[PDB]
Amino acid sequence: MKYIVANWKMNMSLQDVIGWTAGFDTSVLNADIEAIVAPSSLHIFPVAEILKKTGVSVAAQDVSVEEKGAHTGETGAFQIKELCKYAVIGHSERKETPEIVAKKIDICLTNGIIPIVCFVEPKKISLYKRPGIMYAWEDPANISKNGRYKEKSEEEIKEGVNKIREILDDKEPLLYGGSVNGQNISGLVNIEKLDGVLVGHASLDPRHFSGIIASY
């Protein structure tokens, strides 16, 4: 099973989101693919409604630490679960401490969300590691900037995955993120112990994103 996550961050208008879902070629989906789209919080419902029964899954981009109740401005796990299978947790842009990320992981699991936990390098994994989660290795030094890609080499990613697999030695799902695009996806597809990619900038183009899925 391979996972391809679109992290739209805060780049999209409502019209952007509607047009993307129209321009997205669902024929690239197959039984061995799990395509996941992560819209901004107020676009989750229209995305889930449009993509219902396509096979595409929805993710939140973050989850509140708080339980259901009087927390103005907080979007809870119990709400996100109703519309989303996954949640991206601990993205480097949010600069959250490990204690906060661990609380978010815990409330995801308590509510039946599969958290996709971002981490900057292999030695950060053990702070989060627990059953039932997905892992996304994304180095902030390799996140794209203004649409220009800052990718790692195949060799660094291969060595990092091998290194990660010494901790994640039970086939835990592992993704890679950082300037993933059509120019480098083939090299990532070929990494045996890698289970997919977390895609930022390139996922804003639905034809680019479907082409990345098609490379698997």
Next chain:
Amino acid sequence: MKYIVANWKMNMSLQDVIGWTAGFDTSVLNADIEAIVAPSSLHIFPVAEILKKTGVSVAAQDVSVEEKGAHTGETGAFQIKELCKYAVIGHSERKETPEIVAKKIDICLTNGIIPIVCFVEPKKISLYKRPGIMYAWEDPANISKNGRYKEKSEEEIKEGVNKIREILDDKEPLLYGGSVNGQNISGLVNIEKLDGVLVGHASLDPRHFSGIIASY
């Protein structure tokens, strides 16, 4: 002209939201009030799609400090504007610094959103005051607790409003929040220097909310 804001905080499921609209009697609306509903971020779209066509305005419960761009988990003023007229900013539950609140006011106004600025006591107004905003005095001491109302006395409310109106001396819109409910709305309605209410727990029942609206 009076404003009645429902702050649903993080209390509602999607089914709750749907059930709420089915129980909200919009015949209580009229030219002399504006009802504003502030759902969780992921419910703004379905709430707006159901309620705006009946005359109800929508608010976000928060805005990001960030501009459009690569900000995972952040919901931007530019996105909120496409669905909402208003945004609740600076609610005491978020414990935001005045400098953060000021930035959120600024990005609202730049994006054409009317911010509803919460503040705990009249001395905090000066840090925020600028044209084009709505004010909401809410003392954390009088926020309800798991359904138990902790109202302020009408004398202490009237004294606080008088003090606020020495600073807010040009008919700026002023709301009051803090355990507002059927049992004390009549006294608030009769405070001429007040322009409406910010309602948390009581706004979770549509009939209670519409009964509050109908009190003006």
